[PDB]
Design a protein around this ligand. Structure first.
Ligand code: NI
Ligand code: NI
Ligand code: NI
Ligand code: NI
Lengths: 238, 569, 238, 569
C-alpha cells in the first residue's frame, strides 16, 4: 500500500466522521468534534467520487447539518471547516464557511462589549492631503508607513506629509486604485520620530533640517509631488 | 559466449542501453543512455548467485572496500540516465560503475571493490535519484519533516519557530536565541536542515549577528516589511558573509513596484519564492523577474499544475488566511489582483521553457510539503500532453525534459543555497542521500530512503510477518533514523562564519555541521537545464504574460496523473 | 485487551479494507491502495472465521475484484498480496498471486525493450564437459562457482575444468538430479584469475603450475573424475 | 565569430584537436585527441592579455579558488593525450578542463576558478606528464637524487645505506636502525622516497619488525641468498602486511632453477627486477617469468635499447663488478651464461609487445639513474623504426605506443608499489608531481618540475641577468627545494603498519608521511597498456626466446635518438 503519514491521518479522520454519522443516525445531537469530522469526511468522500468540483463541495458542506442536528453552542463554534481532498486533478483545499446556523442561545466565549467607541491617536491633530495614483497598478498603504515615502507613482503634496502616517486604525490600510483620487488624514509620527528604512529617504531624526534633505533625495529619485527648491545646498553628510 | 533474449535479461538485471521505461502513470519515457556493466558479469544477490565469497565478493579486497553497493541501478540524474552500480563508503558516494571482485572479473576499479565488509542492496528494475531538496519550508510543525521524508525529500531549508503567527506567514527564524532553539531541536530529525534568518531590518549589526549565530541566509518577507532599504542592507551583509537571500516581495506596492525592488536588488544574486505571485509578490507583475540574469526563480506547488479547481481553491484560501470579507469591495480588489489565473496558466509553460528553475513547497503556508516532487512530475506530464515532445530531445524519449524537471528539485536548489558540493546529485564524492523508486511508482511513492549511506526509511510490512512484504505496508523508520546513528546520517547546514566560530561545539550539536558556500557568484546561468533568460512583459490590465514578445499561456487540466491511482485519500 | 503493536496495525488494515469495500459499494473504481487493503481484510476475516484453509484463501483472494472494479493500471501494479492471518492452528502467511486481471492499456512503469538479444561473456570460448551426479542428493551450481571445486560426488573430467566457470547468465544455476547426466559449457574465469575459497583446492593464482597442486589435492580428498599422475612431486609450499 | 588560421592559433595557444607533434628527435608522433577549451576564451598571461582582474581572474571567485593554474597544456598521460588547463590547489590536482572566470566566460566549473590567489604558469606549446617513478634505486650516493630529479623522476623507491658493499649490490635497507637512519636522512631531499627492507631471512619476526619500522616492502637479492625458504617467508609476511616484494633471483641455480623459484612464489604477487637477466637472475631462462600472471616484470635501462656496443660493455662491466679473470675458464663460463645477447635483443621486442611492464634504473649498480625515461623513449623509437607502427593505433599517430611506453615509468610502477592513489598520473585528486616538457626536448631534458604543487626545479639562466633565459642555463633548485617548504612538497612512503604506529612522530619526520596500499591483490593484468601474458620458452642451448611458439628477437641499433644531439657529454 505504501501508506504515507497523511494517509493514516485521513483514515483516522474518515472513521471519526463515520462515528459522527452513526451517532447522528441514532438521534444524538452532535457536538463540536462530531460536526467537524462529519463535514470533513463527507467532503473527502465526495472528492474521491470525482463527480463534483471544489466550489460545489464548498457550497455542499453547508447543507449536511441542520441546526437541530447539533448541540446548543456548536454552530457558533464552527466558523470554518477546511479539509484537503484529492480530486481527479490533484489535491485541493476545500473550506466550508459557517456550515451550521445558530438556533440556540449558548455562545461559548461570548463577548459582552461596552457600547462606547474607542478614540485612537488621541491628542494627534490630523491634516488632510489629496492623493492620486497616476500609475497603472494598485497601491495599498498601511497605518504606520511613513507616508512621505510611499510609492513614487502616487502624486500628492509630499512636503505636507513629512514625518506623518495615516490616521486610521492600527493594522488597517488605504487602497489606491490606478487613477483613483481621494483624500486621507495624516497624523504626526510619535515616539522619538526616528525614521529608518521605508525608502531610505530620511534614515535619521525627523525634523525641519532633515526634511530638506529628504525633499532633495525624493526629487532626485522621481517621487511625484515633490517640490524641493533648486540651488540646493548640500550638507557635510548626505 | 551465449545469446540472451532482451526480455529475460531485463527481467533479471533491469533495462539496459536502448531500453525505455515509463515513469509512473505519466507519458514521460526514459531511455537508458549507457550501461557500465560487462554482459555476463552482473552482480546478483541471493542463493547460488554471484555476490558470494570468492566470486563477486573479494577474498582479498582493496583497502577502499565498500560499505554498501547498489547493484544494477538505473540512475536518473541531471548528469544522465544510465545503468551502473553505486558504491557507498563512509556516508559518501565512493564510486559509480561496474563493481565486483577483481580476482574473478575484468573491469573492477579499486573504489568499487566488494569485499566482506560490503552490504548488498538490489536495484535491478529500480530507479535511483538524488534526495529531493525543499528550499521553502515554513517550520510550522515537526510533523512536516516525516511527511516530506516519505515523499523523497532529504533536505529541508527554511525558517520558523513553530505554529507562531510570524512563522505561519514567513520562513524566518529570527535572532540568535531562536536560531539556537531550532538548531538544538534539529538533532531529533531524519532530514538535512538549514535555517534562514530575518532579513527584514536595516540594522547591519543585527543582520550579521544572525549569520554568525548559524543561519545559512536571509528571508525578506512582506509581512515583516519588504522595503528597498531592508533589501539593500540584507544583500550587502549577505555579500560579506556568502549566504543566500530569499525574498517575498511587496504585493501591495506600498514602497514601490517591481522595478523599484529590482533597483534595490541592484544586480545581486537573489532567490525569489513563488515568483508567479499567487503566494505573494508585486501585483500583478512579479513574474517578470523570472527572466533576469541575477534572479533564481522558484515556484510553489499549489499553483502547478494549473487545473480547473485551482483558481477557486486559491481564492477561498486567500480569503481565509488574510481574513478577508466578500462584502468589502477593497478585499475583493486585493483578491482579484492577487490570484490571476493568467499568471498561473503562464507558470506551467514557463516551467516547460526553463524560465522557472526551482520547485518548492511553501509548506502549510499555501503549499503541500509532501507534494513537491509529485506536482513537478504532474506539471511535466501535463506539458508533454499539451505541447508534445521537446525539441531538445535526442531520440524517441523524453530524457531532456526528464532532466529539466528533475533539476528543479534536486540540483538547482542545492546550487541556489550553496550546498551543491554535498547533496543534489548522484555523483562520486557527494553525500549518499539517495531515493529508490520502482518505475511504476516513480514520482509519488518511493521504495526506500538512504540517508548518509544508511537506510533511514522504507516501505515495510507488519513486524510479526514471516517476510517484509505482507500487509499493512507503510513507511516506517529504519535504523539510521534512531539512536546515535541519526547523528551520523544527518547534516545541519550553517554559514561559514558560524562554522568557523565553532557553532557545533558551542551549542553541543551531535549532527554533522557543514558550511554553505558559493552563494553570491551564481546567476540564472548556473541552473542546470533551466537557464533561459528572456524579457517578460505583463499587461497591467489583462494580466497576460508575454515572453520575448509572444504570449505565453497554458490550459487547465481536468485530470492529472499520479493523483487518484496511487492514494487512498 | 493487552493489544500488541501487531494488533493495532491489523486493526488499521481492517478499517482501510472496510473503507475500500464501502467505496466499491458506492460504485467507485478502486485504486491500488484500496484494492490491496480490500483483499487483505477479506483474507483476515476469513481466517478468523476458521472454516477455510490457507490454500483455499490463496485461491479465494483472486475472485474478490473483477477487472472492471478497479481503475485502469491497478491490475498490473498488484503482483501479489501477502497477509499474515491467525487461523485456529496459528499464524500463517497467505499470499494471493495476481489477484486482478488486466483489462485496460495503462501500465505504470511499462518497459519498452529493444528486440535485440544480449551477448554475455563475449570473447570467451566455451568448452563442453559431460557431468554425472553419482550421489543420492541434488546438486546445484551457480554461474560464478569455480567448477573445478564442485561437490566431490559429481563425476567429470576435472582437469579440463580448472580455472573455469559455467557459461550461463550471471546469477543463474545448473541443477544435477541424483543420477542425472548432462553436458555443460565452461568459460575461463576472468580478471586476475585469483581463486580463493570454494574448497581450498587452489587458494592462489590459477595457472598450469597450480593446476598440478590442485589436481593432487583433489585426488587426495576424493573428488570424482580427478586423475592426477602418481609419483607426485611436492613443492616447497603446498 | 571570426576565423583564425590553424598556424597562428597553434602559435598562440599550442596544438589543438587533430594536430600532431613530434616527440623529441624520435619518430613517435602524438595526436591531440580532445580539447577542453572554448575557442575564443583561452587563458593567456601577459600585458594586455586575458588573465587579468575582472576578465579571466575572477573578482568574485569561488571558495575552491586555485593556487596555481597551467594554461593550454598538452597532457600526455596513460588516460589520454589532450589539451586542457590544470588547476592545482593545496598540493593536489584540483581540476582538469577549461579554467577561468565564471563572471565573463561560459564553461567554468567551481574547481577550476581563477581568482586573486592564483599563480599563472603558461603551458602553451608544452607537454605535461606525471613525474617519473623509479623503483630500482640503489641508495649508494645522495647525488643520485638530484640527477634523477633533473631527468623527470619525482619518486625514488629502493634501498641502501650508502656506499657500503651490501648497498653496492642490493637495494636493501636492513633493519630498524638503518631504516631510521635513511628515513631521517630523507628529510634533505626533493624527491618522494620509500625504502625496501631485507627479505633474505627465514625469521618471520625479523621480517615483520622491518615493515613496522617504516619499510614499504622487501627486496630479495641473491647476494644475501635467494633461497625458496626466504622467498616463502617473505611473501607470507608481505601478505600479512600488504607490502610489495621485489626479487633478484639466483643466477647460479644453487638452490634450484627458475621453476623452483616460481614454486616458492606459489602464485603470489611479485615484482621482478631486470627480468631479462643481464642484471642477475636464473641463467639463462629467468626471462620466462615475464609471461606469468602473478609477476610484475621490470627491466633496467642498461640493456635497452639493444645496440652494437651493448654486449661488450656488459661483458666488461660484469668482469669488473664480480672481480672475474679472463684466464679462468669458470669465470668465462659464468660470464657467457649471464650476458646472452639473445635475451637482450628479445627484451626490446617484449617491451614493444607489452610483456615487460616497468622500466627502472638499477642505479650505480649496472644502471643509470638519469636515463630511465630517455632509454624508454629510445627503445620506443627503435621499435617503431624496426616493426613500424603498432596495429593498436587509431589514426596516423603513435598514441597507443606512446601510452604503452609512458606507463612503463609512470603508472605501472606506482600500481606495483601501492602508491597509485597519490602519484603516477595527471588525474584530479592526485599529488601535483608534474613535469613540463618542450616537445623538441621531450624525454631527455625537461623544462621544470612541479613538486607538491610548487616549482622545485627548473632550467634557469644566471642570477645576475636581466631575464631568466640568458646563458649559462642549467637546472637549479627552486623555492620548493629549500627551507621548510620542502617538507610540504615531499612525501615519505611507509607501510600502513608503521603509519598506524606513528612512525612520523616517533622519528620526528617533517615530510608528509603516507602509507602504501593495495600491493598484494594486483597481477600482470593491472598494468596499463602492458598486460600481455604469454608462454615464454628459452632454449637451454641457443638461448633463443620463443613467445607462444614464435621466436622473438630484435636487431641492435648502431645509432639512437635523444643521445648526442642533446648532451655535451
Ligand atoms: Ni512567500
Ligand atoms: Ni512562504
Ligand atoms: Ni638485481
Ligand atoms: Ni639492483
Amino acid at each position: 500500500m505504501k501508506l504515507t503519514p497523511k494517509e493514516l491521518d485521513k483514515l483516522m479522520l474518515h472513521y471519526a466522521g463515520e462515528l459522527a454519522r452513526k451517532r447522528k443516525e441514532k438521534g444524538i445531537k452532535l457536538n463540536y468534534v462530531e460536526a467537524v469530522a462529519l463535514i470533513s469526511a463527507h467532503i473527502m468522500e465526495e472528492a474521491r467520487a470525482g463527480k463534483k468540483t471544489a466550489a460545489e463541495l464548498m457550497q455542499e458542506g453547508r447543507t449536511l447539518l441542520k441546526p437541530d442536528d447539533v448541540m446548543d453552542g456548536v454552530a457558533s463554534m464552527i466558523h470554518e471547516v477546511g479539509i484537503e481532498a484529492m480530486f481527479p486533478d490533484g489535491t485541493k483545499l476545500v473550506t466550508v464557511h459557517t456550515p451550521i446556523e445558530a438556533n440556540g442561545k449558548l455562545v461559548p466565549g461570548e463577548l459582552f462589549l461596552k457600547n462606547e467607541d474607542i478614540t485612537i491617536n488621541e491628542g494627534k491633530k490630523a491634516v488632510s492631503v489629496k492623493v492620486k495614483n497616476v500609475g497603472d497598478r494598485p497601491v495599498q498603504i498601511g497605518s504606520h508607513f511613513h507616508f512621505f515615502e510611499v510609492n513614487r507613482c502616487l502624486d500628492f503634496d509630499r512636503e505636507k506629509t513629512f514625518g506623518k502616517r495615516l490616521d486610521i486604525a492600527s493594522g488597517t490600510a488605504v487602497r489606491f486604485e490606478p487613477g483613483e483620487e481621494k483624500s486621507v488624514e495624516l497624523i504626526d509620527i510619535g515616539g522619538n520620530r526616528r525614521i529608518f528604512g521605508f525608502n531610505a529617504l530620511v534614515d535619521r531624526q525627523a525634523d525641519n533640517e532633515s526634511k530638506k534633505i529628504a525633499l532633495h533625495r525624493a526629487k532626485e529619485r522621481g517621487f511625484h509631488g515633490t517640490k524641493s527648491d533648486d540651488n540646493y545646498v548640500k550638507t557635510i553628510k548626505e | 559466449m551465449k545469446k540472451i533474449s532482451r526480455k529475460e535479461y531485463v527481467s533479471m538485471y533491469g533495462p539496459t542501453t536502448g531500453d525505455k521505461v515509463r515513469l509512473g502513470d505519466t507519458d514521460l519515457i526514459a531511455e537508458v543512455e549507457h550501461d557500465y556493466t560487462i554482459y555476463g558479469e552482473e552482480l546478483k544477490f541471493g542463493g547460488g548467485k554471484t555476490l558470494r565469497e570468492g566470486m563477486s565478493q573479494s577474498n582479498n579486497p582493496s583497502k577502499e572496500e565498500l560499505d554498501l553497493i547498489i547493484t544494477n541501478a538505473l540512475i536518473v540524474d541531471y548528469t544522465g540516465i544510465y545503468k551502473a552500480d553505486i558504491g557507498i563508503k563512509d556516508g559518501k558516494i565512493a564510486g559509480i560503475g561496474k563493481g565486483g571482485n577483481k580476482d574473478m572479473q575484468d573491469g573492477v576499479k579499486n573504489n568499487l571493490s566488494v569485499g566482506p565488509a560490503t552490504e548488498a542492496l538490489a536495484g535491478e528494475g529500480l530507479i535511483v535519484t538524488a534526495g529531493g531538496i525543499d528550499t521553502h519550508i515554513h517550520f510550522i510543525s515537526p510533523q512536516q519533516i516525516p511527511t516530506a521524508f516519505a515523499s523523497g525529500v532529504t533536505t529541508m531549508i527554511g525558517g520558523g519557530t513553530g505554529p507562531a503567527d510570524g512563522t505561519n506567514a514567513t520562513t524566518i527564524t529570527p535572532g540568535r536565541r531562536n536560531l539556537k532553539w531550532m538548531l538544538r531541536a534539529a538533532e531529533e530529525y531524519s532530514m538535512n536542515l538549514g535555517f534562514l534568518a530575518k532579513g527584514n531590518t536595516s540594522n547591519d549589526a543585527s543582520l550579521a549577528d544572525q549569520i554568525e549565530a548559524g543561519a545559512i541566509g536571509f528571508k525578506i518577507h512582506e509581512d515583516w516589511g519588504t522595503t528597498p532599504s531592508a533589501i539593500n542592507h540584507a544583500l550587502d551583509v549577505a555579500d560579506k558573509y556568502d549566504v543566500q537571500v530569499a525574498i517575498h516581495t511587496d504585493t501591495l506596492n506600498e514602497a514601490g513596484c517591481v522595478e523599484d525592488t529590482m533597483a534595490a536588488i541592484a544586480g545581486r544574486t537573489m532567490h525569489t519564492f513563488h515568483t508567479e505571485g499567487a503566494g505573494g509578490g508585486h501585483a500583478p507583475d512579479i513574474i517578470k523577474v523570472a527572466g533576469e540574469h541575477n534572479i533564481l526563480p522558484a515556484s510553489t506547488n499549489p499553483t502547478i499544475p494549473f487545473t480547473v479547481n485551482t483558481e477557486a481553491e486559491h481564492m477561498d484560501m486567500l480569503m481565509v488566511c488574510h481574513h478577508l470579507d466578500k462584502s468589502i469591495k477593497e478585499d475583493v480588489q486585493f483578491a482579484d489582483s492577487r490570484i490571476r489565473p493568467q499568471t498561473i496558466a503562464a507558470e506551467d509553460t514557463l516551467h516547460d521553457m526553463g524560465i522557472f528553475s526551482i520547485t518548492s513547497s511553501d509548506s502549510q503556508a499555501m503549499g503541500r510539503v509532501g507534494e513537491v516532487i509529485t506536482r513537478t512530475w504532474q506539471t511535466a506530464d501535463k506539458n508533454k500532453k499539451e505541447f508534445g515532445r521537446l525539441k531538445e530531445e535526442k531520440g524517441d524519449n523524453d530524457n531532456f525534459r526528464i532532466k529539466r524537471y528533475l533539476s528543479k528539485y534536486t540540483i538547482n536548489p542545492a546550487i541556489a543555497h550553496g550546498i551543491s558540493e554535498y547533496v543534489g546529485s548522484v555523483e562520486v564524492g557527494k553525500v549518499a542521500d539517495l531515493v529508490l523508486w520502482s518505475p511504476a511508482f516513480f514520482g509519488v511513492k518511493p521504495n526506500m530512503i538512504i540517508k548518509g549511506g544508511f537506510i533511514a526509511l522504507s516501505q515495510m510490512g507488519d513486524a510479526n510477518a514471516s517476510i517484509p512484504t505482507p500487509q499493512p505496508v507503510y513507511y516506517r523508520e529504519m535504523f539510521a533514523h534512531h539512536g546515535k546513528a541519526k547523528y551520523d546520517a544527518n547534516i545541519t547546514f550553517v554559514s561559514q562564519a558560524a562554522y568557523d566560530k565553532g557553532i557545533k561545539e558551542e551549542l553541543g550539536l551531535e549532527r554533522q555541521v557543514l558550511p554553505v558556500k558559493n552563494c553570491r557568484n551564481i546567476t540564472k546561468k548556473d541552473m542546470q537545464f533551466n537557464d533561459t533568460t528572456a524579457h517578460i512583459e505583463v499587461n497591467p490590465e489583462t494580466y497576460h504574460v508575454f515572453v520575448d514578445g509572444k504570449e505565453v499561456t497554458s490550459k487547465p487540466a481536468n485530470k492529472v496523473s499520479l493523483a487518484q491511482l496511487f492514494s487512498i485519500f
